[PDB]
Write a structure and sequence with these properties.
Strand order of the largest sheet of chain A: 1-3-2-4-5
Bound molecules: magnesium ion
PDB class: transcription
Entry title: The cryo-EM structure of the Nicotiana tabacum PEP-PAP
Number of helices of chain D: 2
Largest sheet of chain A: 5 strands, mixed
Shape of chain D: globular
Helix content of chain D: over 70%
Order of helices and strands of chain A: EHEHEHEEH
Number of strands of chain D: 0
Strand content of chain D: under 5%
Number of strands of chain A: 5
Largest interface: B-C, 43 and 55 residues
Structural class of chain A: alpha/beta
Oligomer: part of a larger assembly
Organism of A: Nicotiana tabacum
Chains: A alpha/beta, B alpha+beta, C alpha/beta, D mainly alpha, E mainly alpha, F alpha+beta
Radius of gyration of chain D: 11 Å
Distance between the termini of chain A: 30 Å
Largest sheet of chain D: none
Chain A: Thioredoxin-like protein CITRX1, chloroplastic
Structural class of chain D: mainly alpha
Radius of gyration of chain A: 13 Å
Order of helices and strands of chain D: HH
Keywords: transcription, PEP, PAP
Chain lengths: 109, 318, 383, 45, 88, 275, 293
């Protein structure tokens, strides 16, 4: 019973095909990787500050190896800061980034 | 992979006494003495053990008074519980109890333990019972190193502390013999380990090696001069260094960022000058003693410093 | 087909003895390319008894390595002279990274900072159906270094060039890194190709082979892993990957007949490393292998086994850049392999002791603004 | 500038050496010299 | 110039052997060693009568001796007090 | 053995019983105390602050030690107390030997001066470094004890020289290499490459203070070029033609050079710390 | 948070041939400081590689093996000057060096022609001074070993004069312990002092010694790949006499110090054969008697 909930193959490609009023943070992680385990803690700390203004989900990279290559992922610790509106783009981050950058991306972009 | 070690002998004299012998033959001249002395000092005083720390009886006036039905006094019962050998791997405090009734002899098989702690001897003598009287005793187990002095007596009333000894290894010994290789001097190393049954001599050897490695590791860390155990210990530190205090922002600036030709850059690097503050500390006269330098590069560095910074600390004309 | 700016000759003036090593690529923090199932030499008798105190992962997965910045920091810690050539942003993250490298003695003169592009931010487009993202909207600083920006002077002083396959993913950075490789090769120097196949290159073997065929020919020293070696060829893994005993089926030393196809003219040595457990080297006239420990305190945040590969590469480069005339000798290569194994084990110990254990079920420790971690003694509690 | 000794030093020799060092250097130097001699003698014994 | 000699110098400066040398040096200009004691006691009394709490660093006698040694060209600490910076 | 000549080891309970007045004054002076009862309760509570204040008080306060039998005139001396754990007063071995130490437990009375005059007199007159000569005739009362004399004798004794070191006559058929500095000799001894009794040749920097006896050299190898070697029983002088001492080598062991080096370095360190 | 940190408190460069360093390891527990200090001192004094001059080929220069006409100093003096040369290198195996100087009056200093691997720390060291006009040619050989050169590779040399020079990069090392404890806790701080000859900084010596110690203690973790009378004394204390035997055999076993049945069972048939006047018929009869019960 945590904030960030697990997703699957088909249910994750539905919040982008529909509509929303809050940004969506798609997180790729693998159980094996060490760095990701850290990233999850700061993602939960960021989500506990935005309980209704932001949605944070996570998807593994071992059961969904097909949904990762077409997502254009290059490494385990990766995030996607997609926006509600259409037209505005997607932000892909690669690595262990501080929480200040995440706040400055979800607020000013 | 030329160095080979093997357990030469392995015996079990008693359930609380183990003996193992080892060999390290292809060793070199001066390495044997160091390895031997370090392993001896690590096997005696660096391995840790679990022992009973506090005992709580049902109703006794003092630890020196006797009790009906039991031959030994409370002091002898405490001394017998002191010799109980236990095995654990998790730090903290656990509770145990003995609740034997009836005539007979209370032994270690009568101690009930948490699922983490186990017993080794399972046949040690605690006390003797002669009358059908319930014997109910409380226990407290703790893992630590060395020997503990029962100085504190707070946080609990009606319990008698016992001075435990957390020393699994009884004795150790090493011997060094020559290999007979002619020109090159090679030596053979032996090791004898006596353990109290809580862990085999091989496990004690591995644990002593790991403890020595853990003691020698910190010399290879970064030299200390912000919260530890954090991967972002450099981001917030740099963010607050230039924001909290003055005259420290020059320390964060290095020569590399300041555009410079390769010659002046590598010459200043060979002169043990790495930061801008170090370049500001030495006057213009010091830049001449370094070899492979001229008078024009001094003008160049002064001009780019005036372009980057307002003035100089000690590089002014004097 | 290359340009050189010689100018004044300052070779014998102030170059110093330790040859400069140019580590090319991106500057990231805690980024692991990929991960494949692997094995490890451990004592299962000691693990079955301390199952309540030792963190042993269910399925072991080792990453090929870390990043170019990590290798540079490791080589500078070993005592070598390193220099990182890459492009970064001018924001707080890029400046913090530069600081890290600098405080560790890596030379950042080559690094170039941009004010318009960020450090780790890439803009993407939804694209057509199927979730096919397009990265065209903006490149990151890392994958956008112009051919012009390459600092020629460093490549002239450096005697060994290091680059990974992570930079060769973007079409813009691929041409730049190939130009840098050929420039460093023509000016005089050896090229170290550390193939760390990222996630998209694990689809098929033929595509992965034809993708890195532009490389693998301009490099003299190549470091591959056992999984990547089996993936490039038609070798299928026939191990258990989950057993609790060493059966010698793993840690297999392939005969030289399997290494013949991928071999070329200017290749000198090939290191196939199964971690800090066993490292095999293949040369023109002889080949052998060196065993290792790979039994270290393994905690979460450190189970990917990346510092091991970083230290192995750092030690190999440190030993091969000092005596370049003995890259083919057998005894010197064995000493290099042993030193690299020791360095990898030491770096893994250091990373396990620096990044502590995650908090257990009962967590009351002070919350670090970016993570949460406890020491080793704190993780050894009852509940 | 002390005399180099190549023979055995008994108690009388040490007494004479201390009596001469007190007159040549003073009690301040002699105290530290005697402390260092004590340390070296304990180490050797 | 013996290279390995800094340890005992630090030991002399820390343990407090500087005062044993300073007393013997100051007793080289006075005829009677009793008039010197009386003069030091009188100076210490006069210095402690002016400011009670501000008698020096810790005491007044050490302060008087440090003042007498600093007026002769020998730099000495305030009342011979130098704490250990390596105390956790 | 670790104590200096002026410092003495004072037990904790004796120290607090002696400086109770001073520590109560220090508590009431600055803070953390409002009355005598609260200060006494804090001192009885065994808090770290009271021990810190006790150390700060006894940092530079002289204390007097006097044996119960005052047979000799040097039976009453002054020391500087150091806070030590235990129930026994720790003293210097030399002062203990000079105070007629016994096998049985010798009781020691501890007195603390109060007035400024008493403190000045104890610091300037009654210290041990100011009274080293006995008033009988002037002989040093502080001499090395049994163990120190044994160590010095083992150092400066040497080893066998004749039939006890060689079996057959050396007339039928090299020593350690010529050590340029005594530092190299001590380093080779610590590396366990030469024994403590193994002879060696130490290059002497022509100090001309060649200590020997009135004994002519055993042999003088006068060559044809004009440089003759004067071989003595303990040293070698290489002299050129025009009366020039080229080289001087001394044949000794590591103990003699160790003692000489330690005395010289003690003198030099004292002279440097004086400045 | 209770993390073992190390700092360099003091650092001095007395000359180009001497250095100094003082280090501190604060949060050490009780009993660990002395062990760490002893181990680090042994590693600094014995487990650090050094480079020096092993052999000197002086046959090229004109000399009569006792004195040189051009060189003011003797051959022993120039050898003692050559053995004091400090070198910084990462050589594997052996390397050759040569020094040739031509001039009427010259002082041979830092004139060694060295490969790029080897470097000279102090350029002011004098090999030979007041050299008269002569062809001065010297062939040198350099090695890199930890302890010393125990045995030379070539026992017979034509004109090469071996120099018994110790490498010894670190000149001296010492440790001290300062106890800081209030109450039940007793913390200890280690104070390491290092003196190097200039070939390497005192800070690098710590890292080298620590890595050497780790490499020495790792092998203990290496793991190879896998591929009536029925009581106790009623039979044990049975001396051979009670079990009936022919006389010959009884006497023989006795001379062989075989009294009980355990001594007979411990001895095998081969050594039994070794016994004098013992035969195969006997071995079958003793086996039968031991089995006839
Ligand atoms: Mg007595």
């Amino acid at each position: 019973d945590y904030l960030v909930k697990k997703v699957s193959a088909k249910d994750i490609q539905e919040l982008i095909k529909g509509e929303r009023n809050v940004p969506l943070i798609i997180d790729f992680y693998a159980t094996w990787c060490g760095p990701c385990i850290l990233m999850a803690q700061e993602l939960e700390m960021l989500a506990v500050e935005y309980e209704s203004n932001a949605l944070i989900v996570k998807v593994d990279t071992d059961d969904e190896y097909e949904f990762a290559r077409d997502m254009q992922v290059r490494g385990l610790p990766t995030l996607y800061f997609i926006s509600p509106d259409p037209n505005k783009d997607a932000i892909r981050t690669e690595g262990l980034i501080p929480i200040q950058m995440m706040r400055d991306i979800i607020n000013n972009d | 992979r030329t160095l080979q070690w093997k357990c030469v002998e392995s015996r079990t004299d008693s359930k609380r006494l183990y003996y193992g012998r080892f060999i390290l033959s292809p060793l070199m001249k001066g390495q044997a003495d160091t390895i031997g002395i370090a392993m001896r000092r690590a096997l005696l005083g660096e391995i840790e053990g679990t022992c009973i720390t506090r005992v709580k009886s049902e109703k006794v006036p003092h630890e020196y008074s006797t009790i009906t039905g039991i031959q030994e006094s409370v002091h002898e019962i405490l001394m017998n519980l002191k010799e109980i050998i236990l095995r654990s791997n998790l730090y903290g405090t656990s509770d145990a109890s003995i609740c034997v009734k009836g005539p007979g002899s209370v032994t270690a098989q009568d101690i009930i333990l948490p699922p983490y702690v186990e017993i080794v001897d399972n046949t040690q003598h605690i006390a003797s019972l002669t009358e059908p009287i319930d014997f109910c005793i409380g226990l407290q187990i703790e893992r630590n190193r060395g020997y503990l002095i029962k100085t504190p007596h707070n946080f609990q009333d009606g319990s008698y502390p016992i001075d435990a000894v957390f020393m699994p290894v009884r004795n150790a010994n090493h011997s060094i013999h020559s290999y007979g290789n002619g020109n090159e001097k090679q030596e053979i190393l032996f090791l004898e380990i006596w353990t109290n049954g809580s862990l085999t001599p091989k496990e004690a050897l591995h644990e002593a090696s790991r403890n020595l490695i853990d003691l020698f590791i910190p010399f290879l860390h970064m030299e200390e001069d912000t919260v530890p155990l954090s991967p972002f210990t450099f981001h917030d530190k740099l963010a607050k260094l230039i924001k909290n205090k003055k005259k420290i922002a020059l320390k964060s600036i290095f020569i590399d960022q300041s555009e410079l030709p390769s010659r002046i850059y590598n010459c200043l690097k060979m002169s043990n000058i790495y930061t801008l503050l170090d370049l500001l500390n030495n006057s213009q006269e010091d830049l001449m003693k370094i070899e492979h330098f001229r008078s024009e590069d001094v003008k160049r560095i002064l001009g780019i410093l005036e372009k980057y910074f307002v003035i100089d600390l000690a590089k002014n004309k004097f | 087909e290359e340009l050189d700016f010689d100018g004044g000759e300052d070779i014998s003036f102030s170059y110093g003895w330790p040859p400069l090593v140019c580590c090319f690529g991106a500057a990231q923090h805690a980024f692991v390319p990929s991960g494949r199932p692997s094995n490890r030499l451990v004592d299962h008798e000691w693990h079955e008894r301390m199952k309540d105190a030792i963190w042993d992962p269910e399925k072991f997965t080792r990453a090929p390595g870390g990043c170019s910045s990590n290798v540079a920091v490791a080589l500078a810690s070993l005592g070598g002279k390193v220099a990182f050539m890459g492009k970064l942003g001018d924001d707080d993250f890029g400046q913090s990274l530069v600081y890290f490298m600098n405080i560790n003695k890596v030379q950042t003169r080559s690094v170039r900072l941009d004010s318009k592009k960020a450090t780790a931010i890439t803009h993407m487009k939804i694209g057509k159906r199927g979730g096919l993202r397009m990265t065209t909207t903006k490149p990151s600083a890392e994958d956008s270094l112009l051919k012009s920006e390459i600092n020629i002077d460093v490549l002239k002083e450096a005697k060994m060039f290091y680059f990974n396959t992570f930079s060769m993913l973007d079409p813009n950075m691929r041409l730049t890194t190939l130009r840098a490789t050929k420039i460093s090769k023509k000016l005089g120097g050896v090229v170290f190709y550390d193939v760390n196949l990222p996630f998209p290159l694990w689809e098929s073997g033929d595509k992965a082979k034809t993708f890195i065929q532009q490389a693998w020919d301009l490099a003299d020293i190549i470091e591959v892993t056992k999984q990547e070696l089996e993936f490039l060829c038609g070798i299928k893994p026939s191990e258990r990957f989950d057993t609790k005993d060493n059966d010698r089926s793993k840690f297999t030393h392939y005969p030289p007949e399997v290494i013949a196809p991928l071999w070329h003219e200017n290749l000198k040595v090939l290191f196939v490393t199964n971690g800090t457990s066993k490292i095999h080297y293949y040369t023109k006239e002889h080949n052998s292998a060196v065993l290792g420990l790979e039994d270290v305190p393994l905690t979460p945040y450190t189970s990917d086994m990346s510092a091991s590969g970083d230290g192995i590469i750092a030690g190999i480069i440190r030993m091969l850049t000092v005596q370049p005339h003995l890259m083919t000798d057998k005894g010197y290569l064995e000493r290099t392999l042993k030193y690299a194994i020791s360095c990898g084990v030491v770096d893994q110990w250091l990373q396990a002791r620096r990044l502590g254990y995650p908090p257990k079920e009962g967590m009351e420790d002070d919350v670090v603004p970016d993570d949460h971690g406890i020491k080793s003694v704190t993780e050894r509690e009852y509940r | 500038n002390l005399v180099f000794h190549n023979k055995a030093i008994n108690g009388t020799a040490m007494k004479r050496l201390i009596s001469r060092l007190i007159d040549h250097f003073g009690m301040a130097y002699t105290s530290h010299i005697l402390d260092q001699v004590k340390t070296l003698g304990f180490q050797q014994a | 110039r013996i290279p390995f000699l800094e340890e005992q110098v630090r030991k002399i400066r820390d343990g407090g052997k500087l005062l044993t040398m300073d007393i013997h040096r100051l007793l080289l200009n006075e005829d009677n060693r009793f008039d010197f004691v009386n003069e030091i006691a009188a100076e210490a009394k006069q210095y402690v009568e002016n400011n009670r709490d501000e008698y020096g660093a810790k005491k007044a006698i050490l302060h008087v001796l440090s003042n007498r040694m600093n007026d002769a060209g020998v730099y000495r600490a305030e009342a011979y007090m130098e704490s250990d910076p390596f105390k956790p | 053995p670790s104590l200096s000549l002026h410092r003495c080891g004072l037990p904790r309970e004796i120290a607090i019983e002696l400086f109770q007045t001073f520590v109560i004054r220090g508590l009431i002076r600055q803070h953390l105390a409002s009355n005598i009862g609260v200060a006494k309760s804090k001192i009885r509570e065994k808090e770290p602050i009271v021990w810190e204040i006790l150390q700060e008080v006894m940092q530079g306060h002289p204390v007097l030690l006097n044996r119960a039998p005052t047979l000799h005139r040097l039976g009453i001396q002054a020391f500087q107390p150091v806070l030590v754990e235990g129930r026994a007063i720790c003293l210097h071995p030399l002062v203990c030997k000079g105070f007629n130490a016994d096998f049985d437990g010798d009781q020691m009375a501890v007195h603390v001066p109060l007035s400024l005059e008493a403190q000045v007199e104890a610091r300037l007159l009654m210290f041990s470094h100011m009274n080293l000569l006995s008033p009988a005739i002037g002989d040093p009362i502080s001499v090395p004890t049994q163990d120190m004399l044994i160590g010095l004798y083992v150092l400066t004794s040497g080893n066998h020289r004749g039939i006890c070191v060689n079996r057959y006559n050396p007339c039928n058929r090299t020593k350690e290499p010529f050590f340029s500095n005594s530092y190299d000799a001590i380093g080779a001894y610590r590396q366990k490459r030469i024994n403590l009794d193994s002879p060696l040749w130490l290059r002497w920097r022509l100090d001309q203070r060649v200590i020997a006896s009135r004994e002519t050299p055993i042999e003088v190898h006068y060559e044809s070029l004009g440089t003759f070697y004067e071989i003595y029983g303990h040293y070698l002088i290489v002299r050129s033609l025009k009366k020039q001492i080229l080289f001087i080598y001394i044949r000794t062991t590591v103990g003699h050079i160790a003692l000489y080096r330690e005395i010289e370095e003690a003198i030099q360190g004292f002279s440097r710390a004086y400045s």
